[PDB]
Structure 1
């Protein structure tokens, strides 16, 4: 369901409904879960670090605008496509302090 939402539904929500008068919205880009610290340094966020530091495991959405831009952060379901843990092996999970 979540993969369906990311890989298809999101683009439909952005493109097929919104256009202003001009600025037309283009493709939507979903990053990997990151965090913009108070230090200013933005870095990759891993689930364990997210739960320990009471952070939000979310990626950033970036849309192309005509006549690119950050529009917000979408919470990522664990072991989904945009999650680091989906491609991770057992040893990788053990290293990431995530239970296999």
Structure 2
């Protein structure tokens, strides 16, 4: 398969966990459900 490089992910993009998180899942993850998420960490 081969691993090459690393790509930082934009919050709430398809590839981000939060994208599918419900209002509840988000709370557990200590993430505000009001966070819009169009940035990187």
Bigger Rg, structure 1 or 2: 1
Deviations 1:40-81 (A, max 9, x none): xxxxxxxxxxxxxxxxxxxxxxxxxxxx00001100000000
Under a length normalisation based on structure 2, what TM-score does the superposition of the two structures give?
Answer: 0.78
Greater strand fraction, Structure 1 or Structure 2: 1
Give, in angstroms, the shift of residue 95 of structure 1: 0.3
Greater helix fraction, Structure 1 or Structure 2: 1
Runs of 4+ in structure 1 off by over 3 angstroms are none
RCO higher in 1 or 2 (8 Å CA, sep ≥ 6)?
2
Structure 2: unaligned runs, 5 residues or longer: 34-41
Deviations 1:24-52 (A, max 9, x none): xxxxxxxxxxxxxxxxxxxxxxxxxxxxx
Instruction: Tell me how many residue pairs correspond in the alignment.
Output: 33
Under a length normalisation based on structure 1, what TM-score does the superposition of the two structures give?
Answer: 0.33
Query: Partners of 1:92 and 1:86 in 2: how far apart?
Result: 11
Structure 1: unaligned runs, 5 residues or longer: 1-67
